[PDB]
């Protein structure tokens, strides 16, 4: 790892620590989970997602190179990646003990039923769980995890990106930092084809993004559902 690559990693780790609270303190402020419209978990999960978008923005701002992109390109990258980075960053609370996201409260332990009660079907939910499990099984170090989120966000192939050459240059610098980290630090057998496996997770995220988008488009078209969404969610997923 070069001095620059070490600095990239330190910046990303700090950014994550500043935008991911592992105590889940802020969750009391969300509208309450209702588990008893049948979309009873829509308000709570809308608030959780809206909060998560704010954190992804805060993280992206710190990725080296990101703020040198035009405003338009920064916006395109964030609107297109937000759901994906949310899925990635949620892996940190995900637990293979019961295939749930454990966020420090009995009622903030989210399961497949919860996501269905925000309007989603198993067409999204089952691949989502498979994704979380596969990702957990990679046993990523925190450095690998934050690099992967950064690479996800800085993707030159997102629809509407203007300066794809600059976005690619930034992404390749992050990708090379990741490959060097794996070579230098990740022990066998976990390191074997790790970079490839991580790149595959990015491809899996594109598929989950497409399905989430389709389902979101449908559920949000119902004014009773849309009225329960936050302005930020409406804008970012719109």
């Amino acid at each position: 790892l070069s001095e620059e690559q070490q600095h990239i990693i330190a910046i990303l780790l700090d950014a994550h620590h500043k935008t991911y609270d592992p105590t889940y303190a802020d969750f009391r402020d969300f509208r309450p989970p209702v588990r008893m419209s049948p979309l009873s978990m829509l308000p709570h999960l809308a608030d959780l997602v809206s909060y998560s978008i704010q954190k992804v923005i805060g993280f992206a701002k710190m990725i080296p190179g990101f703020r040198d992109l035009t405003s338009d390109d920064q916006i395109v990258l964030l609107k297109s990646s937000a759901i994906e980075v949310i899925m990635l960053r949620s892996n940190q609370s995900f637990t293979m003990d019961d295939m749930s996201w454990d966020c420090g409260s009995q009622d903030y332990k989210y399961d497949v039923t919860d996501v269905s009660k925000a309007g989603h079907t198993l067409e999204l939910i089952e691949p989502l769980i498979k994704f979380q499990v596969g990702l957990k099984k990679l046993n990523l170090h925190e450095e690998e995890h934050v690099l992967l989120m950064a690479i996800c966000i800085v993707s030159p192939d997102r629809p509407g990106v203007q300066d794809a050459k600059l976005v690619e240059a930034i992404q390749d610098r992050l990708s090379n930092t990741l490959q060097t980290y794996i070579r230098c630090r990740h022990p066998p057998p976990g390191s074997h084809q790790l970079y490839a496996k991580m790149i595959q997770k990015l491809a899996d995220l594109r598929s989950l993004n497409e399905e989430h988008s389709k389902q979101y488009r449908s559920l949000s078209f119902q004014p009773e559902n849309s009225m329960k969404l936050t302005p930020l969610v409406l804008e970012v997923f719109g």
Partner: peptide
């Protein structure tokens, strides 16, 4: 709107 305003600078 909200995104642009947050990213402004």
């Amino acid at each position: 709107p909200m995104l642009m305003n947050l990213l402004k600078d």
